Amino acid sequence: KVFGRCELAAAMKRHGLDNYRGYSLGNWVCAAKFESNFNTQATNRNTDGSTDYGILQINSRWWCNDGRTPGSRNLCNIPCSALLSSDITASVNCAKKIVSDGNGMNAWVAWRNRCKGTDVQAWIRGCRL
Template sequence: MGPRMKAASILALIGCLATVTEPKIYPRCKLAKKLLRAGMDNFQGFSLENWICMAYYESHYNTTAQNVLKDGSIDYGIFQINSYTWCRREELEEINFCHVACSDLLTDDLTDAIICAKKIAHETEGMNYWQGWKKHYEGRDLSKWKRGCEVP
């Protein structure tokens, strides 16, 4: 193997090792089906449409969304779950009621995010935790959010 081939091989290897996590943005209907399978429809009395529109408002269905707040805490993932109370950042000891690393809320696998969102809805005032939902969607007709998605 010549020097150019070795260099090309090394660059290819470095490229594989330095892969960047691409944001996963769920299509609305795919997210609706995933949330339905996870038992979110009528969880704590909130229809599937509520969960779909809340996720849209919070993250635009982006699993890697992060938002740094004025108090230094960070909202993570598709449901924008806050680090101060609900998850743990490696460098800080936080309350972590969901018993999950905040980084686990940033993956394409929504299992941890859904479990934590259910815990938040169960242990707080339902969906009132999500101020965007409360301000923009509470008490409104949300039927359009699952329209065309082939979900009941």
């Protein structure tokens, strides 16, 4: 599913991402835009042989099982295929565990390089939330 900006904003707010660990909703929408272009079916292979899955490009090295990432872990206890659903629940529940892990949203390199320090409220402009 390719979400619209305000459809994703609304889905992330309902699932409790707005101000989760102090990250305002625009941070999460900005991250999704640059990780996946709001595409739930987005997959990207990393140099280390891990893969990133879904709207928030969650990595198979630590967080989900795809059965082809050596000496990986599955800390969110889910197959990486569950991160590609039209329903963002499994992505949101894994993102909450990632962002609690210690370095907050710096875990998403695209957030650090493209969103961090920018006017992220622009991402939720005109949205009926």
